[model samples]
Every structure is written in structure tokens, then in C-alpha cells.
Target: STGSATTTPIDSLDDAYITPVQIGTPAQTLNLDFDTGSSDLWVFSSETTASEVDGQTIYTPSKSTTAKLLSGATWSISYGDGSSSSGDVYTDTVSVGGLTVTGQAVESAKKVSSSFTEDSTIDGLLGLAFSTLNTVSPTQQKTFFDNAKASLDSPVFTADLGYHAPGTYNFGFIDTTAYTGSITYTAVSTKQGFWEWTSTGYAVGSGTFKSTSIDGIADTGTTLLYLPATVVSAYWAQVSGAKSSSSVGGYVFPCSATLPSFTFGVGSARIVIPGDYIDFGPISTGSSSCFGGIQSSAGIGINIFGDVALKAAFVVFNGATTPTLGFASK
Candidate 1:
């Protein structure tokens, strides 16, 4: 379920971010990306020199007396999803909006590249996805959620994705407007780093074109929807010129003003995602075009739901005791 996101090339295997929750006193805010592809809650800091913290927003830990650094255990991590600079861990009086969770573990990553330090917004990233997919070798790292879950107001963590939001991503306060009711949680696989499962069927724009029912896996870590040849052909057929021009790469289509909508049905739930979300941007091939989310796979698995489908639905990964992924509407 790995995908790319512009310069950040962030770990989209799962949409993870960190939000500042304050407890007692006036709360402070720190919203960051939560990546399971790597471990560490790192933020740009004012202590970093201009050469080090150019386009990043530093979390001035000095402002709070409670902030402490994690000695000499500085670490750097690179993953299939993205890259991250690491440093020692510290416990400080952290705050996220009105809620305050004191003595929280935070990592102040010092040596960051342009991808991270160049970002004007986002204080930092808090990885809470899982320990299985950790990029770090020797595997001593633990996710922020693993360390803080015992203290959170709600053991359950909910992420509300805002497609058009200014920052592109935001956390805290689960939005119920687009959701149905209750999340269908999933059990984490010890081997696969990502939370995966089989799907019932794949649909294109209101189920007009449906793929032959088969076993499909849902990946929070992958950005594009991947499917077999049969399903991909059936899906692109809905559009005018989207067809397989090459044998290895699958289908290609002409630039069209309008793109279709794709959906994935898992059990009784149906996740609808716009085709534009998966196609090339305005500059990819001179103009925007729609490609099948389901790629060419030598007639293997029919379809795999990526972030496009996940963003449209509320996916809850509960591995602690319940071991279920409860799904709710946006």
C-alpha cells in the first residue's frame, strides 16, 4: 500500500499524523504526520540552525520547562515509503488544543532534509501505525501511540481526513458528518506492517461497472488502488479512451475533462473515491487523464484498495485487545 506524495514522498502506507493535545494550563498545538512506516515523534526545533531548519516550523521546546531531550540515542531512518531524521526521546508537558496529555514522549529530529525542513506548515510527525513495518533495524523503536495509549482520554484513535483542507491533513476531533455509525475495526497482522483484508467486489462510479468478485486486500499504507487485468479493464471501460496501450504497464487513456468515480465494497460497506484522486495531475502527460486504480498484475489479485478508498471512509485499526478495524462514515 505504499504511495508517493510530492516532495515529501511521505509514508502514505498509512495516513498518520501527530496533533498537539494540551492538558491543564493554556494548551498548545502541534499537528504532525503519523507514519507507521517509521517510528518517532519528531518536530523541527528553534535550536536548529537556519541551514538545518529552513522551511520547517520548529517546536520551541525551551518555551515549556517540561520539555526534555532523549540523551545520545540519535537515530536516522529511511523506508520504502519515505525518509526521516531521528534523535533522542524526551518527555515534556505536551498539549493538543484543549486536551492536555502531560509527560508525553517527543523526539526532536535535528538533521532533516529539504523535504522535511522545507515544509512551512506541520510542526512534526508522530508515527503510531505499528511496530511490524518499522524501518529501523534491530527493531528497538516503539510508536508514540504505543507509549501514550495508556494515558489517552480515549483508547481509540480516530482520524478525519479533509480533502480540501488548507494543510491537506488534520487530526483531533473525529468528524461524524460523513460517517455512518461505529467503526469496523481490524486485527493487525504480525508480519505485514499494514492492516490488510479481503474485499467483496470492486466498483466504478456507482457500481455501473463491477469487477468479477474475488479476494482483495485493503491497505492503509498504499496510495493507489491496484487491481488485476480483468477488473482494471472493466473499470476503465466506463470511460471513453482509457485502454491498455502497453502490455506491462496496463491501461492508458486520453486527457479528459471529467474523470469517473471508483468504489470498493468490503463486506456491507462501500467506499467511493473520485477517479481524479488516482490519475496523473495536470502536468503528468501534458494534460490530466484517468487510469485504472487496479493495475496490471499478470492476472493475480483483482483489486487492492489504497489511500483513495481509505480516505473516503473512517478506518479504525484496533490491535490492542479488541483486534478489529471498525468502519464508520466520514
Candidate 2:
């Protein structure tokens, strides 16, 4: 009733994590981004335009005997990264690790933005967020997690994201050995169709705690942690020669500058993100300036605890009728 999927970072910067997923009767294995920020299990497929298709893998539904067209069904997604994809829909057997779901809504991309075509790391994206966010038209489709949760021993899944190593996503149960201290449970609001919650407070390095409530979403799909301007400014000020550039498009600092750690509270628990993790990478190869992992979310509408923060701890997504979130240190 339980299953596990391995997640491998696509690059040293840990831009995104890719997981091998099996789909259709013939079982075409595709590398997909397990995104927790959005809902809609979509993939690149034979239906896509040839010119738009690069070297990425595509799901050929014709080869699968069990594939059934969801007549009149269509889906589309426009991401914060400015990447977009739109496609028709089909129902078929899909499996992640050993968790199988029949009649799973497998969206086949007919069109994708340029960025998706350029990135070969993920053939598609497997959404792990609430199904309420599904973009399918005529009838909203359920996510792979929604259909798979019932068969699971427990209607929950856990995400263990890593910095430079492979992590694992487990369904139906939590892996005790994967984390250290006990978990800090927090109420989640799926009203926004995201795993959103509010952190009790935050601190820059070992600085004084600011007891202000900051609401954000736990988004595995995003690459960085975006917080309120005050928080980001406080953290960046600690580093010498740090500045936000319109050209760089984010906060950056001299590679030689000493960066400070960031800490956020969940209930009474504190999770610290090491400074090294904040130094994303040099803006360009061998460049003296480095991009920051934490940025201001002023332009993003909402704050986000993206991969940069998720990689710092183990996160649990409770999918019960009343959903909640659990955070644990590792």
C-alpha cells in the first residue's frame, strides 16, 4: 500500500529534482519533476509538435492498450518561471515506484513553452499538490496523488529533498530514519490550492527573532525561497557587497563574501538553512558574483518555501479530508 520514488537533482545548483515514473501499459519510463506547487499530471508526448520537441522523452499513448482518451478534456499551465504547457487528456495506468493507479488522468502536452523545450531534465511534471488546482477544462481532473492516496495505507506522502544528493518521496507512510527530532505539525490551507502555511517567525543568521507571521507555500516546483522584503533584506545585509540587480534579476553578492544562515520557526521548532546553501551558484561559470537562494517575494504575489528551504528538512503532506503539513529536521 506504500511506495517510494527516488529524486535526483538535475544540476549542481539543484534547480529541480527529477524522478523516474512509469506510465501506460507498455510502461514508458519518463523523468518528471515531482512538483508540489501545482496540480495536473502532464507530460510531453507524441501529440506534441515536432519542432517544439527537443531531445526530451515523450509518452506515446498509442503504444499503450489501456490508454483511453478523455474526450473534450484539455489542460493548460502557466508557471511563475514563465514556462507554459497545454494539452489534451487521456486516462491510463500510471505508477510511481510501486504505487499504481488505474484510470489516472495523464495529460499529454501538445504545446510547451521554449524553456520546457530547452530543458531536457524533465520530460514532464508530476504534480503532488492538491487536485483542486488541476487545470483540466470541462471537468477538472484529479492528480496522481489524489487517486493513489486511497489505495495507500494512509492518505499521505512525504518529501525528503537533498542539496547535492538524491532524495526520496514516500507514499502512505513516513520514513522515521530519514529525519532527526520529532516532527512539528502545522495546519495547512488548501484553499489556495497549495500546501500553504504561516511560519510563526524568522531570524537572520543568529539575529533577534522577528515575531511576525509570514504566510508561504511549500513549493517543490520552485527553485528558491522567496520571503517578505524585510526578511530578505535583513539576511542579505549581513553579506558584504550584496545587492539586488535588475540585470541579474535577483539578489546577488560577491562570491568571496561571507554569507549568513537563515532560520525560520514552525510552532516551537527552528529550521536553519546553512549559508552555503544560500549561495546558489556563480551567476555565470567562474563569475565573481553569486546568485542568492533566498529572494524577495514582493513581485511574486505570495511567499514560497521552495526547494532551497525544502532541502533543509523533511516535509510531510497530509492528504486527509482536512489536510495539514508536518516539518522535521534531518
Candidate 3:
């Protein structure tokens, strides 16, 4: 077997993508956000207090015959946006697609911030980051990929994220048919928990690609692409009505403005984000004002290639060798 699984988008909003995974005995299915930026497999569960959990389906460990408590173990994680969750841990069977792992660490949340409370559809996050970033205290837990990697045919996973459409996430093996042309490969610096890499340069519309380097992480959990303030300002400069708005936050442009496509250089290959993709949904209902998807990664130490960027290419997070990242157009 390929030890592979396919993921389906949870909604057309393109805010986040989720996949189904089976946990515990009798295979209780849960929809999990496969976040490559964080490392933890947590879920809303029997552990979460009633008031904290809104419409989420909680995982009941007691009902699973194989569930074992990891005594004195606990996990707490805060996102860049300040959303957080924390709870105790358990060991049980967890399966994604056709791959299955026994004794996988499953964090059951006892508390969650308002951000999570309102995003009720998400059960929990499945961290695809390096196991070293796992939030489990005292004894850090391994991600599902780490636990299942030994048995996989290849230590690789491909992320095919689409805009307002379903995209597949392939594990262990790459499906050549999922993408077009050749995949451009680049070195990844794993000093951080993220799949960070540097782009050779970027260009707006048909302009020349410069030699400036932009270091960024491939983050699936995040919705919009974030570049340095200077880069963002340069891109928006081409738009007639684009402006940095305090009321709307980030850059906002009139819905009628003509926007140019943005391209980023990755080694010898280039990935281009369509101009229209930059125009995020309207800032408010029936408002001509719209938010720009490409914002500044000012406070964040590095840029974030969120869904808006990833959706423009088929990304491969190759764990083999020096952990090279491969990108291709779908």
C-alpha cells in the first residue's frame, strides 16, 4: 500500500481545509485541520468543559476500549492570532486515509479560547510540523507522520490546496498526475518548526523578477498570504485604489480596481498568484471595499505562505534528505 490518504476541503470559504481521521476503537471519525505550521493532534472531547465547546463534536475516550491516559501529561498551545487550547493526553489508535498508527498521542482539550469557540466546525488541529514542536509537556509527542514514517514507502507528503475547491493531500508518495509540468525543488531550513524557505525574488504582473530574498514558511492553517511590509507595499502600488486602511486593517482596495498577478521566484522556477486571487472577499457585506489577501508579516518573524499562496501551486514537503520543498502548478 502507498500508506496514502486524500483530503477534502471542508468548505468553499477557503479559510481552512480539513480531512477525516479515525481515532480510538471502533473508529470514531473526526474532522481535523492538518496544520503544517504547528505540531499537535488535539481534538475537542469529553475533556472539554460544556461551556467551552460550542457546536464541535467531542471525542469520547472513555468509550474507546484501547484509550490509555498519559498520566501527568498536558498540552497548551497559543496561535499567532492568540487563539489557544489546552488539555490532557491519551494514547490510542489513530488512522488517516489508509495509514494507521497505534498508540498515537491524542490531546483532548479541556479549554479553548473564544476564537476556537466561534470556529465550531473545527474539531481540532492535526499538526504536520516537526515532532519537536509538539506541545506535550514533560514528554513531547510525535506527529502522525513521524509515527507512521518508518512504515511509509517514502518519507514525503504533498499538499494540493485549491481556492474554493477540494484539494487532495497525499502521504508517503507523490501522485505525479496531481500536478502539471515539473516540480521546482528548493532547500528548506528546519531550524524552526515550520517548512521555511527563501524565494529568490518576486515580480508584479509582467515586471522583472528582482534578486531580493523573502524568507517564509508554508503554513496551511493560515488563510491569507503574508509578506514583508515593503513587499506588500510594492505589490499594492500597482493597484490604483489600494491603500493601507486602519479601519479595515491591512491593505484594502476598491472592488473595481484592476489588479496585477504576483509571482514569486523559487530557485529557477516561478509560482504566480492570479491578480483576482489577491482580492479577498468584501470587507463587509455589500461593501465595495475588499481586503487584500497579501498582507504584511511585520510582527511575525518570517513571512507566511498561507492558503492564498499555497493554493497557487502543488506543494511537496519532502522529509527525505535535507527536507527539500517542491512546488508545481496544478
Candidate 4:
């Protein structure tokens, strides 16, 4: 059966979107961050020490008859943003939207880093990346989507991430009404457990497209777009009084500066990101200086096409076949 759910912006952060997911026999619901950049469905649980879990909800496996312990299995994960979680494993029924998968491996956290414990709104992460990226020991676990796909009419999911607005994530079917115009498709490389693709070129505003190639991944969990150092330097050069500061950790510019449009190529089609969207947020509250949404991916190795870029288009994550990515202007 097909499934669909609404994704809501959390605290206007624009960093992540959360959707409701149900786990176990009696169905304990949790608000989970749908992360396409990594794998492993982990949640705050009774297994976590009370002091380690602040105000977040904890899942109790004993409360669900369907939950069964996978003795000796464990998982640990660390993200580029420095957030991490580690825990024991259990096999239980898991469902997203309306699609249900029986015997899905669910990791119960025994410990979480400050980045996660401090954030009380999110109870866990619902990984949408390839199942091979699962972090369980001895054997990797399949994601809810992976286990449910065979029963679906078609193995595909579409993400419609709106700017400061509510969006929809549709599984097993593409809602043509959610987007306008024909979708431009590009081949994706899943070798790294990411939706990685290469852009033929890019440009600023109405300027001619420059002949440059950029390899990057489409990451829904990441807040901003990250590019090569040279590319970031070139883009910020157009903004007056823009400079990178170690204190701020990225390029910062005057909020009043008139920014130029940034465009990147997806095969033959071009996706343009308006200048205002580049102003991520102020370095400090009530400060006039703003941090850029696009920064250098030098330390990270791969460029990240995060929320700033994904929200600019309607994206299709096609897992049915060759795993191509389809983009359309919303």
C-alpha cells in the first residue's frame, strides 16, 4: 500500500523537517527527523539513562508485545554536525505514514550527545538513506522504506520541502499536483550511501553559465548548502563586506547587502537559488551580520546540497530502479 505524510518545520530553524512514525505492536508514536544523508532508525528509549534524556519521550520496548531483543546487537553513529547516538537493538513492527513493515530493526539509544539531548522536540531519526548504511553490528538493518517497498505499488518517494512552510513526503507514488512543469532527471551514485550527483556548471544571476563541474550530495538533514572552497569564495566575492570568520565558522556578510542569484546545473536544466535565501541567519541574535547558507565543504570532502538548495525544488528519490534523482521547479 502507498503512504504519504506531512513534514513540518521545527522552530523555524529550516535545518530539519519532522514527520510522525509509529513503532511496535501497540504503536508508540514519535516525531522523527527524516534524514536522507544517513541510515539507522534510532530513538530515545527506556534504555537511555533518565539524566541523559532531558524532556524527550522515550520508547519502552517492554510495553510492546511485538518488540523482541536482538541480543548482542548494537549501533553507534556520528554525524558531520557532531551529533551522535549509540544503543542496543530490537526487532519490532515499524510504520511510516500508512506503510507498515513487520520485524524492522529499531535501535534504542542508551547514550546521546549534547546535540541530540539538548533538542527535546525530536525523539529519533528516521533514516531514508540506503539500508547498507545501517550501523548495527554483526548484521545491517533495513530501513522501514526498504522493507515496505516490495509491498508498495512502486518503490519511490517524493519530497516537497517548502520555505518556512508545510510540505509533504509521498511514498510509493508521485503526486503530480504537488509540483509544476516536467521533472528533469539526473543519474545518482549511491556508492557512498548518498544521493550524489555532479553538476555540469553554475553561474551567478543572469551571467553566462561557467564551465565547472561540482560533485555533491542531496542531504535533507543538513541545514545549508556546502560547496568547494573556490566556489564559495567566488560567490561571496560578489557581496560587499563579506568575509569568513573563524568565530562564526563560515562566510558572513552585512544583512543589507544586495546579493546575486546563484544557479547550478542538473544535467541540462538549471536550478536558481535567490540571493535572500543565501542569508541563513544572523551570527548572533539581533545582530546585523548574517552567516551564508553556502559555505566551503573543504573539511567534509563532499559538497552538501542541503535544505537551502532542496527547498528550491521538488525532489524525487527514485529507489524503484537505477536510483535516479528527479527535480522540478515548484
Candidate 5:
């Protein structure tokens, strides 16, 4: 079956993106971050520490008659930011749009990192990456996308994220109205459990296109777009008063500065990220300086095309035997 899941931005800066999905016997709905960068479907739950839960909606396995505890199964996940979560596992019915997955592994968090508890916008994360990245030991489980892909009309999903607006993620079939022009496809290497692909090059504002090759991952879970130091420096060099501040950590510029549009090539398609979108937001409340949405991937080692770039185009996560990624300007 085909489905279109409506995604909503958690805050004004598009800090987190979530989609409502049904789980359990009686259909318990929870708003979850549909993440493609990770592979665990972990959630805040009644099983979690009461003090760490904050205001998130929890998934109680006991209430769901269809829920089955996966004996001896446990999972622990740690992110690059040092944020971590760990807990017990259970199999339950998870539904997205009209498609229902019979035995989806649900990780119930017993403990979560401070950032997760502090952010009340998302209940949990539903990973769309390959099952190989799934952290469940002994018998590694599959992602919601992995489990449902076999029966889908087409083993693919499309993400259409909007800037300061509601976005849509469609499963099985691509939504014709969600995109414009044709989609340009490129090979995806899942060896690293990432939707990794190579881009031709980039152009800062209206500058000439660079023909260099850059490899990066398409990560909706992340808020900013990270590129090479040279690329990042070139973009900021065009802005007046922009500085890579030591105190502020990353690059910052006056909020009044006019940012140039950043464009990256995906095959023959060039997705353009508007200038306004590059200004992530003010570093602090009423602060005159703002943080740049595009940052250097120097220390990270791998470049990332996060929401800053994804929101500028329509992305298709094609899960064919030999996976491929498609991009089109929206």
C-alpha cells in the first residue's frame, strides 16, 4: 500500500521534524522524528526514568495487547554529539499512514541523554536507515522502512521538507504534486549504513560552479548542513562581518547580513538553498549575532547534507536491491 505521512516542524527554526504514527493494539499515536541517519526505532516510554521523561508521549507495551516482549533483547545507542539512550526491546504492531508492520521492534528507553529529555518536541525517533545499523544485538532488527518495504508498491520513500512550513514523507509511491521537474538519481552506498552519495560540486550564491567531487550523507536527523572546510570558508568569505568565532564555537554573522544562496549539484540537478535558510537562527534570545546553518565538517570527518540542504529539494530514498538516492528541486 502507498502512504503519505505529514511531517511537522517542532520549532520555529525547524530544529526537529516529526510524523505521527500509530502503534500497538488499540492504535496509540505518537509524534516521532523520522530519522534517516540512524537505524533504531527507540522511544520515550512508561519504561523510561520518570525524571528524564519530561513531557514526551511514551509507548506503554502493557497497554498494547499485540505487544510482545523480545526476551533477552536490549539496545544501547550513542550519537556523535555524545547523546545516548538505552533500553529493553519489544515487538509490536506499528503503523504508518495506511501500512501496518506486524512485528516491528520497539526500543523502550530506560534512560536517555540530557539533550533528549530537554527537547520536549519529539517523543522519540523512527529510523529509516538500513537494518545493518540497527543496534539490537543477538538478532539485529530491521527499521520500519525495511520491514514494510517488501510489500510496498515500490520499495522507496520520498521526503519533501519545507522551510518554516509543514513537510510530507510519502511511502511506496512518490507524490507527484510534492515535487517539480524530474528527479536526478545517484548510487547510494549502504556499506556504512548511510544513504551515502557523491555530489559533483557547489556554488556560493551566484558564483561559478566548482567541479570537485564531495561525498556526504543525507541526514534528516541533523539540523545543519556540513561541508568541507574549503567550501564552508568560501561561502562565509563572501559575507561581511562573518567570523568563525572561538567563543561562539562555529561561524557567526550579524543577523542583518545578507546571506547568499548556496547551490550543490546532484548529477545534473542543482538544488538551491536560499540565503535566508542559511541563517539558522540567533545564537541566543535577542542576540545580534546568528549561527550559520552551513558549517565545516572538519572534525566530523564526513560531510553531511542535513536539513539545511534537504529542505531545498525533494529527496527519494529508493530502497531497491542496489539502493539509489534521487533529488529534485521543489
Candidate 6:
């Protein structure tokens, strides 16, 4: 294995690697999002003429040998990032990490915008998160995990994102020796795949606030892990001798002090964020700063267990085996 116990990037598609991988045949091209937040494998297509979306790669389902149209099933979704798109669904062959998923549903976007485009090299969002947050409703369609329950190499698919640098996102199989200390795997409720809070009294520093919590949706589509204000303030207080700067937002602290490492009690599971992630830069350029990976939102809603929490450990959403969420060390 490449380094055996850490997240490692496999293919860095920085503007070059474009020869769509056919989902079902000898030449099936795949254009989907690998989101950890929502579950579902949606794709944007040539029909997506919603707006001028630059630097985005659209999927050509008709061109693929395995592509099967959904017979005019129109679909659409709006995201919190203030972007929207519309298209149709189709069943085809989808592949990732050398594994092939047949009869997979991929979205054909006839309407997309620049606002939804990512600066990251990825073209489409392949959501491999939890089923609770899936776009596919039992009323509309079956989620990718809901459909791929039989083809998984194992009952679990593991994610190995090695920090923000780059790494491989694996499906199936759970590794248990990725982190230190005892690993507490919590029982996930099927309501949705979000990190729902059990306790309400959490804060950041001396601030007072509350945030709306969403049921159970693990979002890979969103970049930041938003937390309740009180939690955000209290977290800031824990960073050694920290002070807030209006110009940058959030608190800045000493680079040398050993910042506190906090744990999120996710039911029976406890996810930890190491202090090093807070000290992102050297103090010379600006006072070394730290922000809770979690941010404060307006109301009590779904609390997302964003990629920040994900980076610290290994997460395997096993839709292939038993339609269950599996946790292990990366």
C-alpha cells in the first residue's frame, strides 16, 4: 500500500485528466460528486443550461454505452451555497476506485451556474456520505447507497482524505488502526445521516447562542463545518490566550501554546479535533490564528459533521452491503 496508515491522494485531476470513464461499458464516462454530506450520485449534463457555468465538466450520458435515460424524469435541487440546477435522471454504469456500479442513477443537468462550480479540480459532486441526507427520496428515487447495496466489495466503503493536501476516497472495507486512543463507534439512526446533537449546552468562549439542528445529514457537498454560536465561542476560549479580530472573523491566538483538543460527543461516538489544525500558519505573518472547525448558524437545525471532523478519522458509508454507516480508524 502507498503509505498504509494515512490519507493519500490518488489522481490529482488539475485541468488535464479528462476522458470520461464510461459508467457501464468499455467506454462509460463518469461525472458525479463524491460528497460526504449528502448521499446520492447526481450528474450534470449538456441539458443543464441554467446559466453560464465556467470550468465545469458536464456528463454526456447518451454517449455512454451503458447510459439509460429515466424516461423524462425531471429533477432539481437547491443548495445552501446559493446555487441551483435542474436536470433529468438516468440509470447507467458508474465506476470509482476500479469498482464498477451498474444501473446507477446519474443526473443530467440541463441547467447549472458558475456559482455552483468548485475551484477544486472535481467536475461533479459524487456524494458518498450518509443516506439520511440523500437527495433521492423514497417518493422520487432510491439513493446511490440504497441502490448499490449489492455490488460493494465489502459491506463498507472507506474514506481516506489525508488532510486538505489530497488523498484517495475509498469505498468498502473498514480499517481500525488509523487513529490513537479508543474509538467510540456510535449507533446511527436511520432518520438521516447528519450528526445530530444529544446535549444542548455547548459554547465558544463567553458567547451565548443556539443553532438549529438538522436530523442526520453528513454533507460532503459543503466545505465548512458550521456549529452553534455558543459552541463556537466556547471553543475559541479554549485556544490559549485568544482574541477575536473583526477584520478576519473568529479568534487569533498564540502559535506556541498547546491549544486544547476538544471532543464532540456524537451519541456514543467521540470525534476529536487535534490542536495542530487550529494553528494553520506561523505567527510572523499575522498573529497565529485558530477557528473551531464548527461555525455558528442562525437557528436550531441539522448540525453537519463536516470534513474537519472527517479528516481526523476514517469514515466508511456502506451502502453496498447492509445500507449502514461504518466507522473505523483511517
Candidate 5 wrongly placed segments (more than 4 Å): none
TM-score of every candidate? 0.69, 0.98, 0.96, 0.95, 0.98, 0.71
Kindly provide the TM-score of model 5 when superposed on the true structure, using C-alpha atoms.
Answer: 0.98
Clashing pairs in 4: none
Alpha carbon deviation, residue 72, candidate 1 (Å): 2.9
Please estimate how well model 3 matches the true structure, expressed as its whole-model Cα lDDT: 0.87
Write model 2 residue lDDT over 142-246, tens digit each, in one string: 999999888899999999999888999999998999999999999999889999999988888889988889899999999999999888999999998999999
Candidate 4 residue-wise lDDT, 225-255, digit = tens: 9998888888998899999998888899998
**Per-residue lDDT over 33-90 for candidate 1, one digit per residue giving the tens place of the 0 to 100 score:** 5443344556676655568665555666666667765454455665434564655555
Per-candidate RMSD, Å: 6.6, 1.1, 1.5, 1.6, 0.9, 6.3
Query: Candidate 6's residue-wise lDDT over 110-227, tens digit each?
Result: 6654554543344556655555555543336645545554555465555555554554455444455554555444445554554332322332323333333333444444444556
In candidate 1, what residue range of length 10 has the lowest lDDT sum? Answer: 1-10
Q: Rank the candidates by TM-score, best first.
A: 5, 2, 3, 4, 6, 1
Q: Model 5: which residue pairs collide?
A: none
TM-score for predicted model 6 compared with the true structure: 0.71
lDDT of each: 0.52, 0.92, 0.87, 0.86, 0.92, 0.52
Candidate 5 deviation (Cα RMSD): 0.9
Cα deviation of 295, candidate 3, in Å: 0.5
The candidate with the higher lDDT, 3 or 6, is 3
User: Any idea what lDDT model 6 has?
Assistant: 0.52
lDDT of 5 by residue, 215-313 (tens): 999999989999998999999999999989888888999999999999999987799999988987799999999999999998898999999999999
Compared with the true structure, what per-residue lDDT tens digits does model 3 show for residues 282-324? 8888999878989998877779999888989999998885798
